[PDB]
Amino acid sequence: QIVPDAATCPACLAEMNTPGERRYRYPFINCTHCGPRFTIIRAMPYDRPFTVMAAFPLCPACDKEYRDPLDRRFHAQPVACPECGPYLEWVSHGEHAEQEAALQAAIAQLKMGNIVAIKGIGGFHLACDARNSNAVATLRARKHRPAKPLAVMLPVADGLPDAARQLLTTPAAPIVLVDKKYVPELCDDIAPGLNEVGVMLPANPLQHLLLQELQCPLVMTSGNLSGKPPAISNEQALEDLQGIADGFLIHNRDIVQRMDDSVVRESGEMLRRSRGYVPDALALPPGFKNVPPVLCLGADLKNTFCLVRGEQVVLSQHLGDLSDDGIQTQWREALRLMQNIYNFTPQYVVHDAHPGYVSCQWASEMNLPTQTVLHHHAHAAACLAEHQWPLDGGDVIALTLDGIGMGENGALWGGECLRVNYRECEHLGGLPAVALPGGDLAAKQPWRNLLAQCLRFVPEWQNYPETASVAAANWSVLARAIERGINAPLASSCGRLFDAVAAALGCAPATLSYEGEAACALEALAASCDGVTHPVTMPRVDNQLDLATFWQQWLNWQAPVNQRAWAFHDALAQGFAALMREQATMRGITTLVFSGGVIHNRLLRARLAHYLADFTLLFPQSLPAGDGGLSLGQGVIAAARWLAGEV
Ligand SMILES: [Mg+2]
Ligand SMILES: [Zn+2]
Ligand SMILES: [Zn+2]
Ligand SMILES: [Zn+2]
Incomplete structure (x- = not known):
């Protein structure tokens, strides 16, 4: 079974912080219980040769761990160490570094109040000191985002309510909206005019290294241009973000799937369901059984699609506004892998009744019976x-x-x-x-x-x-x-x-x-x-x-x-x-x-x-509640009509 991308676990975090360990301060440490999944898979089965890690043959010490049935890293498909794995690279206006020096360059830039692009699990973030009014205003100015609240990464959950800390520390590691009174350190340009702030914890080794060093809240917002799909390749990050970021902390492990941070309220209410939840399937309601393979396209904004079959449904990650330039590439790659994972070939397509939607135009290209849902x-x-x-x-x-x-x-x-x-x-x-x-x-x-x-x-x-x-x-x-x-x-x-x-x-x-x-x-x-x-x-x-x-x-x-x-x-x-x-x-x-x-x-x-x-x-x-759940609705309705034997 493939499970969602997972936050670095306590054991890998301890291995990473222990001088003398081979993986000491290695930013790509993972084991059988944690690390990238959906985001590093090219095709099934889940096996190193069909993941982005085929490029990196294992050193003997790594391979011995990958092969020992009792080892935490047994069949850890994207396992690596500094000898055989990916490494950090730093790029900034005729300055270049790699490895620990790449990391220190990024840390010095952040501390000086500059803005750095950081490669993550499912895309790239823009970061800066979230207490620094000047840095936050410069980020807003450069990204033309005068108002929209910014997500912030905190080093720890101390001082937040118990319900928030509980959600923040799950393998899914979402952004959790919390009353801004709990976080007085944040400058006022973080979520101006609003009562809540989205906070998250470090969930991959690179983020832990950064926050362990910086010991302060960091803006950690999506690395994209408004009206465009997020970058997932270094070249597209370098291109899109050159006016915005003062330097780039990137690396050479490919991301193959766009996967945004998930966003929930402290109360548990889901706002955006992506990293940490995709590709988990959900059980349909009682009475839904033996349903034929249905592809539901969802709607044009905050798009997710849905695959319905048997007695289950699986929703895609958030894929954004379908009218945006070149978003079909990421949508399609997500459909390909999801269909590959579940061995799914649709027999039916369901889409919105609005005939002006992009999603409706895409449905007509599929050569399947189509149907519409209000x-x-x-x-x-x-x-x-x-x-x-x-x-x-x-x-x-x-x-x-x-x-x-x-x-x-x-x-x-x-x-x-x-x-x-x-x-x-x-x-x-x-x-x-x-x-x-x-x-x-x-x-x-x-x-x-x-x-x-x-x-x-x-x-x-x-x-x-x-x-x-x-x-x-x-x-x-x-x-x-x-x-x-x-x-x-x-x-x-x-x-x-x-x-x-x-x-x-x-x-x-x-x-x-x-x-x-x-x-x-x-x-x-x-x-x-x-x-x-x-x-x-x-x-x-x-x-x-x-x-x-x-x-x-x-x-x-x-x-x-x-x-x-x-x-x-x-x-x-x-x-x-x-x-x-x-x-x-x-x-x-x-x-x-x-x-x-x-x-x-x-x-x-x-x-x-x-x-x-x-x-x-x-x-x-x-x-x-919004358009992010709409594909599911389409799917249960098409299923219920088929189950009734409707023409
Ligand atoms: Mg507090
Ligand atoms: Zn681990
Ligand atoms: Zn190795
Ligand atoms: Zn709606």
Whole structure:
């Protein structure tokens, strides 16, 4: 069996720190229990000749250890020592070094407040002293990332809550989001405007050597260019990162598979499932058996694919935005190895119903029967599958909250109440559909969504101080485009409503630098409020939330910004709760499901659970609520349709 890439174990770490050991300070020490796996395999079977390590014949001392059945390194496929293995290389503007000297050059650069690219297990990181305001601002400037929070590597987990330390020290070694109050050493440009910081521990020998030396937190963020796939080869690292990194700590062991760090909350909630979890298979729910080989393509953002067969499913690592330049190479290499590992040949392909998706174009190149699944049906089903809801388990009422997905008859959904089972999705109601002014621009500039909401729902909107910058523009050109349906499609998007409220509070920049930045900012603001008595509501009118009443009460309820943010989350949760209660009770449904990327909002979860104590509630935990779990949903739905003998 192949197991996920694993953090250096205590025994290899001790061997590495023991003077006189042959592997003393060797940055590529591994044994049968730890080290790279999925990332160094060319083809099956798992055997040194079919791994990146075939290039390095073993010295006799190594080979004796590889061959002794009682030795920790028995059949350690990528075992090596300094005599026979890979070695470090340092590259920096006409300066070069190797081995221990390569390591010391990188350490001296980091200590001086410089930024170094470091080769890891599944790609390259950019690093610098996370206490150094100057270094962190220079990294943000060079990478054009003014806001998006940076992951930080700490030497140890001391001082973090027990739940965080437990997750941080598993073989998977994820990034764990922890309250920033636990880590005062971090300069304030690490996650500005947010309440959490992603911390990780050293999990490969090179990282242990660095942190043992530096004894301070290091920014350890992905080594890529925005809009491009991460580098996995030295040449592509050297090329992509030359404007950013002051020097490069690289080496000559190949990485064959892109594998980003996994990201979880301290609570155990999965955000990004990659290194340490891939390629572990998951058991399908009861009633799923003898399923034919199905390839599920997932969706266009935060992509994962899924292989479904028998009574199991296996998800790929995070592969990013499928629209990015040359991402198909990494996607394809990941598909090849995963199919090789599981001896899998698909008979069917399932993909999203949006005909404009890249993933849909890729499906048509495959020469297999294809089928389509609505985006929000798949979110809801991934959450049912994760909770082991049986094939014949019965209908639930689902709340699927995200930015935008294609719904029935070409509609753009993102804030819907649905009656759902593994075969059917019936739309019951939700947010009103509101123009996205400027189409793709509506996700980047929150004021567009505020304008769209004001035009539809807020009489005399120009008189409110919340709308001043909008009001002062020549917004009437945009208003005219909106009336005429020119690049202004209607969407009932929960994410765009967050954006509209964030625009009205002024709590993100006018143009955003990353997807979801305004919603994250609004939630961080709301979470500093412990709850407040307020008059803001979102009544139910038929089967939609009445935003006219909402805006009138919210815009006229003066209070500190945190309390206004809180009141929005509370009113939205109460209004959706009332919709779901009526829908579920009158159909005799006792179980509710919640899914979509907006459901990663902790305040909204907590408020929903508060108003829906009379129901059994299913939220995602071991898979991402967002598009990272979508392939799974597609897979259980295709399986359930086949199992029913559907045509
Ligand atoms: Mg602390
Ligand atoms: Zn080990
Ligand atoms: Zn050796
Ligand atoms: Zn989605």
